[PDB]
Scaffold this active site. Structure first.
Site, short mmCIF file in Angstrom:
data_model
loop_
_atom_site.label_atom_id
_atom_site.label_comp_id
_atom_site.label_asym_id
_atom_site.label_seq_id
_atom_site.Cartn_x
_atom_site.Cartn_y
_atom_site.Cartn_z
N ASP B 91 34.41 -33.60 42.59
CA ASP B 91 35.05 -34.83 42.11
C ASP B 91 35.18 -35.81 43.27
O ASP B 91 35.11 -35.45 44.44
CB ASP B 91 36.41 -34.44 41.55
CG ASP B 91 37.19 -35.51 40.86
OD1 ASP B 91 38.19 -35.92 41.51
OD2 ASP B 91 36.89 -35.90 39.72
N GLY B 202 37.07 -42.29 31.55
CA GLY B 202 38.05 -43.08 30.82
C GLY B 202 38.51 -42.51 29.50
O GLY B 202 39.16 -43.21 28.73
N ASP B 252 34.38 -30.18 32.21
CA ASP B 252 35.32 -29.54 33.11
C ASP B 252 36.72 -29.73 32.54
O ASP B 252 37.00 -30.76 31.93
CB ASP B 252 35.31 -30.10 34.54
CG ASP B 252 36.11 -31.39 34.67
OD1 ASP B 252 35.61 -32.50 34.34
OD2 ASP B 252 37.25 -31.37 35.13
N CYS B 290 35.45 -10.61 22.20
CA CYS B 290 35.16 -10.99 23.58
C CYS B 290 34.54 -9.85 24.39
O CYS B 290 35.01 -8.71 24.31
CB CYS B 290 36.46 -11.47 24.23
SG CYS B 290 36.30 -11.98 25.94
N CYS B 292 34.43 -9.80 27.69
CA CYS B 292 34.88 -9.83 29.08
C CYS B 292 35.48 -8.50 29.52
O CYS B 292 35.88 -7.66 28.71
CB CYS B 292 35.81 -11.02 29.29
SG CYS B 292 37.59 -10.67 29.13
N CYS B 295 39.04 -7.66 28.18
CA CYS B 295 39.10 -7.19 26.80
C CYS B 295 38.48 -5.80 26.66
O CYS B 295 38.74 -5.09 25.69
CB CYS B 295 38.46 -8.21 25.87
SG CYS B 295 39.43 -9.73 25.79
N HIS B 321 39.83 -13.76 31.42
CA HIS B 321 39.50 -13.80 30.00
C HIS B 321 39.21 -15.23 29.53
O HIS B 321 38.25 -15.50 28.81
CB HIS B 321 40.60 -13.17 29.13
CG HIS B 321 40.46 -13.56 27.69
ND1 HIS B 321 39.55 -12.97 26.85
CD2 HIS B 321 41.08 -14.50 26.95
CE1 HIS B 321 39.62 -13.53 25.65
NE2 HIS B 321 40.55 -14.49 25.67
#
Ligand SMILES: O=c1[nH]cnc2c(CCNCC3CCCCC3)c3[nH]c(NCc4cccs4)nc3cc12
Ligand SMILES: O=c1[nH]cnc2c(CCNCC3CCCCC3)c3[nH]c(NCc4cccs4)nc3cc12
Ligand SMILES: [Zn+2]
Ligand SMILES: [Zn+2]
Lengths: 354, 354
Positions: B91, B202, B252, B290, B292, B295, B321
């Protein structure tokens, strides 16, 4: 694997190295047991294992408050809850927490043993009183005597629960403050009851290393030689080395975890405080020899920034390193005893660490 | 690999799926970029990668304060510092942080581009002003016009630095609040300057989803079709789906990280707040589908306890997660566009999520 088998593979002086076999795994001795809440604050169980830990200490006092021992039992026990499938030694709850029945704050020996069962402990500690320091001979005696009555109650509670008796182990705890005669009486009482392992209680409570060592010098030989010896609450690396020199097989401390998130990192050249400005552009790892993942991948400078910034990742990295350091210390101790060069290791360790 | 190549492999309506090739890696689009401080609060970079992230957003504003852009450069750059070797989008610093020169708090376009270079950014954002909402036509115009002058200054700063120009990419940011005519003027000005990618700035500044979508409907077609489209600061899963339906390629948000440590977990049936008492004995994973690691291994009940207890491990697990959930959402979006069934996926997703 058996419920419990302690075997001594090598000795040097009073130092011993060997293994405790239990149903959930093998424990290499001398052993450092990381302490939890979370197998260890800021670590996944796989990371704790990766550092070399064979066993962890389960914080009964916290868990009995929340989520509650009964709730953990309903959810399948602490191993399942936490995701740690290896041995867990549970504390009795009695240091963190007065009548002959127990302590009101009701935690009695029977309720302690029951809570440890509900959590699914592998090694259960008898419920005792850690006598404050200093203590007068009278107070130390009175305290020790109560603890020995509580030890017998602990034994009976444990034995009256089949599933616990068949699958877990029970350790008794020696009291008697700094007094040789009370330590002997205590050792005698515990051996008459009979336990799977014996802790030295009542130390690391303000007396200082010289006095702790003096008491260990006479107290550990009073315990059965053929069973493991657990020094509760110890400690700093030099305290561990000296305790092993005096016949201790097992240790627990919150120092590596506590100190870590504090900014203290253990190194073979002594501890460093990573928040010091001196580290802000230091690209070396926390320790130049450490094999841990943190020392493979990140710099002092990075961890310095993270801790100064209050970042969770700083706590994660510091903790992983410090628990790994302790495990590497225990491995060096085991190997040196196995090779009959532990006296030399202790001397070399101290020369450099200090 | 090239400095920068965006290729579109499939389309459906205004939605697109493809890849951005850069020197440090390939970025699958539509892409979710986790936001850091720490590649992501409470995660190691390997864990961020394991969730599926191809690129992370580097928080310039925080880093320029401490440890400092120059210090990070001296230490080898942000990739080395953090241990993330894949692309980083930085950024400009200009939302978190007034004159034609820049903002005093001096952060000017030139200094922003310089800081991003010092960090070693792969994708550099032009320095702009996010116009507050609501804005009058006058204020929105004045703001947009300044941002376009700053965009030209950003371009020149970037191009005058050989190493940056040869190895990084530069994105311009469209302004103009909710006004079609100003959005067009802005798009025109940015395309005249020329950028590697174009952000819609914006938005996500208080206008609400209906209005955000209405503005996207006319604003994204104004941008070059052949370059990636980045919607800054967005957002919730339904916002991402709708934005992709309107031609956005990159996103993001701090939501997954922020919300996670808050107790909010994303699920295909909508978000849940794991601190709710309803989860205290729930042995299911956070989400039933999920993939992951969290999980696979831990229950709602466990994570409930950890978050209620203020444990770092709770933040670690919730964050892993939630970032994984977002990556799985982006994968489902990519696959559905590739297969020409994204309209149906959006409908099915919303039906169940709401
Ligand atoms: O006789 C004792 N009986 C029982 N427990 C003792 C404890 C607790 C050991 N680890 C507790 C863990 C249980 C799970 C939660 C965390 C603690 C001791 N800790 C210390 N020293 C600690 C200290 C060292 C230096 C300053 S204080 N001496 C102790 C003596 C006893
Ligand atoms: O025009 C813009 N120009 C530049 N930056 C913008 C940002 C910052 C995007 N992520 C910043 C990250 C940088 C690293 C640190 C963390 C932030 C925006 N964020 C939002 N919405 C956020 C929000 C969504 C909902 C409430 S506020 N609108 C934004 C509009 C702009
Ligand atoms: Zn290390
Ligand atoms: Zn998950």
């Amino acid at each position: 694997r058996p419920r419990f088998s302690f075997s001594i593979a090598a000795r040097e002086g009073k130092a011993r190295t060997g293994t405790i076999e239990m149903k959930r795994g093998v424990i290499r001795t001398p052993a450092f047991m990381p302490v939890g809440t979370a197998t260890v604050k800021a670590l996944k169980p796989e990371t704790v294992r990766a550092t070399g830990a064979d066993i962890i200490l389960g914080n009964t006092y916290h868990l009995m408050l929340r989520p509650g021992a009964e709730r953990i039992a309903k959810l399948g026990g602490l191993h399942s809850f936490m995701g740690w499938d290896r041995p867990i030694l549970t504390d009795s709850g009695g240091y963190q927490v007065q009548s002959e029945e127990g302590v009101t704050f009701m935690l009695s020996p029977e309720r302690s043993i029951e809570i440890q069962h509900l959590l699914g402990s592998d090694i259960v500690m008898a419920f005792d009183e850690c006598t404050p320091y200093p203590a007068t001979p009278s107070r130390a005696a009175s305290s020790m005597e109560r603890s020995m009555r509580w030890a017998k109650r602990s034994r009976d509670a444990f034995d009256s629960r089949k599933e616990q008796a068949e699958n877990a182990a029970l350790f008794g705890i020696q009291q008697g403050s700094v007094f040789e005669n009370l330590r002997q009486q205590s050792a005698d009482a515990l051996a008459e009851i009979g336990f799977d392992g014996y802790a030295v209680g009542g130390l690391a409570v303000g007396e200082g290393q010289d006095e702790m060592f003096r008491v260990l010098d006479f107290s550990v030989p009073m315990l059965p030689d053929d069973k493991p010896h657990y020094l509760m609450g110890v400690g700093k690396p030099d305290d561990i080395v000296g305790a092993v020199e005096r016949g201790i097989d097992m240790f627990d401390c919150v120092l590596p975890t506590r100190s870590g998130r504090n900014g203290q990192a253990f190194t073979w050249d002594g501890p460093i405080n990573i928040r010091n400005a001196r580290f802000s552009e230091d690209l070396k790892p926390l320790d130049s020899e450490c094999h841990c993942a943190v020392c493979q991948k990140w710099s002092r400078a990075y961890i310095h920034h993270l801790i100064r910034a209050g970042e969770i990742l700083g706590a994660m990295l510091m903790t992983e390193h410090n628990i790994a350091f302790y495990q590497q210390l225990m491995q060096k101790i085991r190997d040196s005893i196995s090779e009959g060069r532990f006296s030399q290791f202790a001397q070399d360790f101290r020369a450099r660490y200090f």
